[PDB]
Amino acid sequence: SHTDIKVPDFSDYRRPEVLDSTKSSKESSEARKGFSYLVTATTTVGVAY
Amino acid sequence: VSASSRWLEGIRKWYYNAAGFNKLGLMRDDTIHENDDVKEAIRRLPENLYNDRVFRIKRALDLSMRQQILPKEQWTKYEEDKSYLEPYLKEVIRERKEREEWAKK
Amino acid sequence: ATNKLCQSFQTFNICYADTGLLGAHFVCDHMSIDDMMFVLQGQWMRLCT
Amino acid sequence: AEPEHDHRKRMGLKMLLMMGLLLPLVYAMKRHKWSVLKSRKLAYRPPK
Amino acid sequence: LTRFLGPRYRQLARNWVPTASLWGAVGAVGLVWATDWRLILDWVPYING
Amino acid sequence: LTRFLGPRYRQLARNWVPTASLWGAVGAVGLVWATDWRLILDWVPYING
Amino acid sequence: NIRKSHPLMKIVNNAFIDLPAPSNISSWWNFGSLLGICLILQILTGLFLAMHYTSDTTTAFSSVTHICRDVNYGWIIRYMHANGASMFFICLYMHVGRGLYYGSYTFLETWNIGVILLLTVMATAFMGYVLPWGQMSFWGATVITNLLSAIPYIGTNLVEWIWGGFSVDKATLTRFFAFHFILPFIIMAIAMVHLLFLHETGSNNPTGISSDVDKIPFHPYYTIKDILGALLLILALMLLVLFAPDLLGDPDNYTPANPLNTPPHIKPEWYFLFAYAILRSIPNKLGGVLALAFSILILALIPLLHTSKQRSMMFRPLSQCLFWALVADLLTLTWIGGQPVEHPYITIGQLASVLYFLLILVLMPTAGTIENKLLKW
Amino acid sequence: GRQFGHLTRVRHVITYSLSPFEQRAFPHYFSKGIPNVLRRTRACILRVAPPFVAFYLVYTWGTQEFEKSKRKNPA
Amino acid sequence: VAPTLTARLYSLLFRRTSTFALTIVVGALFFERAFDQGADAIYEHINEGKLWKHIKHKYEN
Numbered sequence A: 001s002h003t004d005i006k007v008p009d010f011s012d013y014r015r016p017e018v019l020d021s022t023k024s025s026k027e028s029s030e031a032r033k034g035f036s037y038l039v040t041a042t043t044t045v046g047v048a049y
Numbered sequence B: 001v002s003a004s005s006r007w008l009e010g011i012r013k014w015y016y017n018a019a020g021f022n023k024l025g026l027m028r029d030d031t032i033h034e035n036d037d038v039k040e041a042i043r044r045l046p047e048n049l050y051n052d053r054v055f056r057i058k059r060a061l062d063l064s065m066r067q068q069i070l071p072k073e074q075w076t077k078y079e080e081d082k083s084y085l086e087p088y089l090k091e092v093i094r095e096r097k098e099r100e101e102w103a104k105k
Numbered sequence C: 001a002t003n004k005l006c007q008s009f010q011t012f013n014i015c016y017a018d019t020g021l022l023g024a025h026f027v028c029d030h031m032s033i034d035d036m037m038f039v040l041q042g043q044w045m046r047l048c049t
Numbered sequence D: 001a002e003p004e005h006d007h008r009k010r011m012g013l014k015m016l017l018m019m020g021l022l023l024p025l026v027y028a029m030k031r032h033k034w035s036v037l038k039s040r041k042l043a044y045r046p047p048k
Numbered sequence E, F: 001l002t003r004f005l006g007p008r009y010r011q012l013a014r015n016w017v018p019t020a021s022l023w024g025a026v027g028a029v030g031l032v033w034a035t036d037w038r039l040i041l042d043w044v045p046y047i048n049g
Numbered sequence G: 001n002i003r004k005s006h007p008l009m010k011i012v013n014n015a016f017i018d019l020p021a022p023s024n025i026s027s028w029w030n031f032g033s034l035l036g037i038c039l040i041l042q043i044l045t046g047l048f049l050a051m052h053y054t055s056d057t058t059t060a061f062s063s064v065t066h067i068c069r070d071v072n073y074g075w076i077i078r079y080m081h082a083n084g085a086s087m088f089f090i091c092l093y094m095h096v097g098r099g100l101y102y103g104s105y106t107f108l109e110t111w112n113i114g115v116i117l118l119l120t121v122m123a124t125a126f127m128g129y130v131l132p133w134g135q136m137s138f139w140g141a142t143v144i145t146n147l148l149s150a151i152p153y154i155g156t157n158l159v160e161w162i163w164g165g166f167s168v169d170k171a172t173l174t175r176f177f178a179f180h181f182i183l184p185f186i187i188m189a190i191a192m193v194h195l196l197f198l199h200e201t202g203s204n205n206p207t208g209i210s211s212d213v214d215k216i217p218f219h220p221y222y223t224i225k226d227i228l229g230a231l232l233l234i235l236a237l238m239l240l241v242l243f244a245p246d247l248l249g250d251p252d253n254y255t256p257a258n259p260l261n262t263p264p265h266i267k268p269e270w271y272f273l274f275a276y277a278i279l280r281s282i283p284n285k286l287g288g289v290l291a292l293a294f295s296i297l298i299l300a301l302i303p304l305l306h307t308s309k310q311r312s313m314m315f316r317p318l319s320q321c322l323f324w325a326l327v328a329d330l331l332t333l334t335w336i337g338g339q340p341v342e343h344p345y346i347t348i349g350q351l352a353s354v355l356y357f358l359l360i361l362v363l364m365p366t367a368g369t370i371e372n373k374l375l376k377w
Numbered sequence H: 001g002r003q004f005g006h007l008t009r010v011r012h013v014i015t016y017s018l019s020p021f022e023q024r025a026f027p028h029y030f031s032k033g034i035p036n037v038l039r040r041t042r043a044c045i046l047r048v049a050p051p052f053v054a055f056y057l058v059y060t061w062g063t064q065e066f067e068k069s070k071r072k073n074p075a
Numbered sequence I: 001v002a003p004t005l006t007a008r009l010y011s012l013l014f015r016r017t018s019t020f021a022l023t024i025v026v027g028a029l030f031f032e033r034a035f036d037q038g039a040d041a042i043y044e045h046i047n048e049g050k051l052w053k054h055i056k057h058k059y060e061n
């Protein structure tokens, strides 16, 4: 009965790269982290200045 | 007894929808302030009613975080609001008043 | 063992076609989940570096 | 009465530009972390 | 807060009224003494100096 | 405190010398940048103003 | 795990990192940390202003001008300190108003410790305004200190004892500087006991319903939310400092103090105007001074006037309207406080003063009881 | 100070979460956010607004009256 | 440029915290020079006649 549990669909939340079930997340693993960590680094630069 | 009673109940149903806790799926007893009488009554709740109370409050806090409400279909209807906690709380209060009356003599 | 952080844990590397699950699983008292997670991840990072 | 007038206006311009950068970036950091919670889904499955 | 109105509570107050009366004398004399209150101390016999 | 002299401890130091070298560049550049150290910054190309 | 076991970091961890906090606290819960940011801002700017300030009546005015003219970036530090004090009162009133709306006063020790923090910050800022020794500085010190003369049979002694003379003079300014220096550090210590009692229960939330079923760690959720709010506090402060540094001050304060002449249009700082309006609506001397004190000390009574069986006003429409009638009424007293004592402002200020105490004492507790009956409990 | 693992009792509640590097930080910011602001404004406008409208009318009348009273009238 | 730009920035500079900090301190250095340069050029363009450094040529000595 715990096998009746399925994770709901996040398609209206996911980023564009990771919406394809038949495509690896490793492909966009590199870009997605850089986009978010770029925002952090810029913030520190502004605080630094 | 429809004429005068239904106008009073009509104003209560107005206030119930105006209060708006039904818009988060909550019931009236979910919103009561937890004092010592209320913690004991909640403690006395059976398993199912306790677990239902927990999830409704959890669902409402999740909504309050997102500044959202449930769809109108899922609002708590005024006529279907169950005062599941009131009978337990009434007994807890009755017991405390008995202690207080014994503490006077 | 010394701090009684869990009743058991196991590491695993579950393989499939072009994908898999690499990690660990453990079982513990409710006041020990955080310490087990901490020590577990610390060892992953320690081996990485 | 206000010899700092010109210098304060130059600083005010720099303050507005940096805030115009930092406010949306810091806002973005807040939403990034909070997105774990804002898209979380709940389900209640009690035994019957 | 009506629960404190009863025969026991009025027996309890009667037991503590001699003590509270005396702690009022301590504070009254202590206030007169610490401030050198001339309005009261002119009447005490030996203090007059 | 002789216990830290061994083959494992010199393998451990070798793993962390690239990281500590880089944290020295962070602090060195951070010190030069925060103090406007003219002795070093006159040599940087675009900074000269 | 080392964040938890070190004797010193365990305090930091259990207060800012692993502290369980409600998942749904709104932006109105940001003012707690902003009050601490304000307190730290005022201590730093204030400390750097004391390095170039003299409490001599003959040079106190000139030492402040020396800061804003000759000290390297002394003016920006100066106007951060002045405007930071106003931002302090913006955060105080929102922090208080948050707690009134959402029923946070039911934490009696935290609330009552809060009322103490409000009064000490008020005393601190009053003495701070006396230091530059302008016209409003001197006559601000004259009016407020004379309030103690209303105390029967000891008032003049308390006033002259505080003044160090028969009037506000050099002895009064030098000691107000010593008090203004030290009182912020006592406030910081009392703010820790404020937080100590709070952590016993954790935070309230907008619903007024217990949130133990849904808690999130303070880090990273409310560290970044508090960081964002601080950047907005700096924005609000720097807009004043860098584009309108005299908008909240009075021009007469740029003339040195003169004990012989009082300006005709006395106007306190904006954060005292509502209570100044309450006092003058009572022509009796002692009566108006007691009404001033009770307009603030009434906060200590709010926990005793709670009648609703629900904690927060989120689900209490009748209380919401009365709550906003109190904000608009306080906005009216602030307006009346900034106008001269003449017709029709005298009568408006009297009606608003009655409405202020009428709302807190009578109307709002009765609304909470009507709401209970409407829900049939 | 309370701590996780000692807060309260919960049973039969499942939570699904997604990593923050897997989803948008501003999903439908305007396409969904603007409708929600209008919903919340409507729900509270009648509680908050009439008091401050009442202040605005009393403010303007008191200022107008004070201005006219200071102007003299022919004897 | 077949690999994504943000993807190459991550592998080279952001993966390690050490190089993630070095890029920030080096970024604040070059950001400070360009930001002050552009900010001052804007404040001066709005006020082209008014400033002293726009009138220092009259007073040669």
Ligand SMILES: CCCCCCCCCCCCCCCC(=O)OC[C@H](COP(=O)(O)OCCN)OC(=O)CCCCCCCCCCCCCCC
Binding pocket: A046, A047, A049, D010, D011, D014, D015, D016, D018, D019, D022, G041, G044, G076, G234, G238, I036
């Ligand atoms: C011992 C030190 C104690 C410090 C305590 C400070 C307390 C915090 C006060 C916050 C002040 C906000 C920034 C003032 C900017 C200013 O005024 O800087 C004026 C300068 C121009 O200056 P310039 O034109 O001379 O050219 C300079 C010569 N090259 O550009 C700015 O606007 C930069 C500010 C950007 C906008 C504000 C962003 C806020 C980020 C918060 C970081 C706070 C750091 C905390 C430090 C403790």
Ligand SMILES: CCCCCCCCCCCCCCCCCC(=O)OC[C@H](COP(=O)(O)OCCN)OC(=O)CCCCCCCCCCCCC
Binding pocket: B067, B068, G028, G093, G094, G096, G097, G098, G101, G206, G274, G313, G314, G315, G327, G330, G331, G334, H040, H044, H048
């Ligand atoms: C003391 C001297 C003061 C002198 C200065 C007076 C000037 C006052 C100027 C007016 C300030 C107005 C501030 C903005 C108020 C916005 C109110 C609002 O956004 O709507 C009401 C809001 C509804 O939110 P709920 O939590 O009920 O439910 C949300 C479900 N989506 O509910 C809320 O968000 C209410 C939260 C509490 C608001 C705090 C305002 C308090 C104002 C000062 C009070 C002073 C008390 C001494």
Ligand SMILES: CCCCCCCCCCCCCC(=O)OC[C@H](COP(=O)(O)OCC[N+](C)(C)C)OC(=O)CCCCCCCCCCCCC
Binding pocket: E026, E027, E029, E030, E031, E032, E034
């Ligand atoms: C408006 C102004 C109001 C002021 C009015 C004046 C009030 C005078 C104080 C009256 C209260 C005295 C009560 C009291 O003594 O009890 C406290 C302890 C216990 O005394 P003890 O004899 O040990 O046992 C009492 C038993 N009894 C009553 C049955 C006899 O007794 C003591 O320990 C007190 C003596 C110790 C003194 C040292 C402590 C003071 C601080 C140290 C200062 C010197 C070093 C810097």
Ligand SMILES: CCCCCCCCCCCCCC(=O)OC[C@H](COP(=O)(O)OCC[N+](C)(C)C)OC(=O)CCCCCCCCCCCCC
Binding pocket: A036, A037, A040, A041, A043, A044, A047, A048, F026, F027, F029, F030, F031, F032, F034, G227, G230, G231, G234, I014, I015, I016, I017, I020, I021, I022, I024, I025
């Ligand atoms: C002699 C002078 C020496 C000074 C030289 C200058 C040094 C500059 C800082 C360099 C250190 C940067 C390291 C760093 O960013 O890590 C701390 C966090 C985590 O970043 P995050 O992107 O979340 O995860 C890092 C993962 N990684 C490394 C694999 C990409 O990143 C952050 O959170 C930092 C950005 C947050 C800024 C807000 C905090 C500052 C206080 C708030 C001030 C504004 C409100 C008043």
Ligand code: HEM
Binding pocket: G028, G029, G030, G031, G032, G033, G035, G036, G039, G092, G095, G096, G099, G102, G104, G105, G107, G110, G111, G113, G114, G115, G116, G117, G118, G121, G187, G191, G194, G195, G198, G202, G203, G204, G205, G299
């Ligand atoms: C220097 C002045 C003050 C500082 C630094 C301060 C700081 C804080 C902080 C950090 C919190 C927890 C976070 C938050 O709720 O935002 C808090 C909570 C609280 N404060 Fe204060 N506070 C001050 C004054 C006051 C005053 C004057 C009152 C009331 C008269 C008050 C009443 C409360 C209450 C009731 C809470 C609990 C709020 C909740 O849990 O929802 N505080 N304060």
Ligand code: HEM
Binding pocket: G039, G042, G043, G044, G045, G046, G047, G048, G049, G050, G053, G064, G078, G081, G082, G084, G085, G088, G121, G124, G125, G128, G129, G130, G131, G132, G180, G181, G184, G185, G187
């Ligand atoms: C809660 C903390 C504080 C508040 C709310 C506050 C508020 C104020 C205010 C309103 C003024 C009048 C400014 C003016 O009229 O120009 C002032 C002046 C002053 N304050 Fe503070 N202050 C605080 C803490 C401190 C501290 C900790 C110090 C020193 C260590 C300090 C030192 C001064 C000095 C020297 C002045 C006179 C210079 C001037 O008028 O700008 N203050 N303060």
Ligand SMILES: C[C@@]1(c2ccc(Oc3ccccc3)nc2)OC(=O)N(Nc2ccccc2)C1=O
Binding pocket: G122, G123, G125, G126, G127, G129, G130, G136, G137, G139, G140, G141, G143, G144, G266, G267, G268, G269, G270, G271, G272, G275, G276, G296
């Ligand atoms: C800054 C200020 C101040 C500070 C703090 C302060 O506390 C309170 C704030 C709110 C309620 C209660 C107290 N009340 C005034 O000190 C000062 O002299 N005036 N102006 C002035 C001029 C003439 C008469 C009275 C005051 C102020 O407005």
Ligand SMILES: CCCCCC(=O)OC[C@H](COP(=O)([O-])OCCN)OC(=O)CCCCC
Binding pocket: E031, E035, E036, E037, E038, E039, G153, G154, G157, G158
């Ligand atoms: C609360 C702080 C009280 C301090 C007041 C004060 O300065 O006290 C002075 C008077 C002096 O006694 P008096 O006979 O000169 O009388 C002179 C009258 N001005 O002593 C008293 O009257 C003390 C009164 C204590 C009441 C609480």
Ligand SMILES: CCCCCC(=O)OC[C@H](COP(=O)([O-])OCCN)OC(=O)CCCCC
Binding pocket: F031, F035, F036, F037, F038, F039
């Ligand atoms: C520990 C506190 C150090 C503060 C010293 C200081 O005031 O720094 C000024 C100099 C200025 O650079 P310079 O090229 O003019 O050189 C002028 C030489 N007087 O910058 C430096 O040299 C920074 C040196 C940092 C070493 C720790």
Ligand SMILES: [Cl-]
Binding pocket: G061, G064, G065, G132, G253, G254
């Ligand atoms: Cl001045």
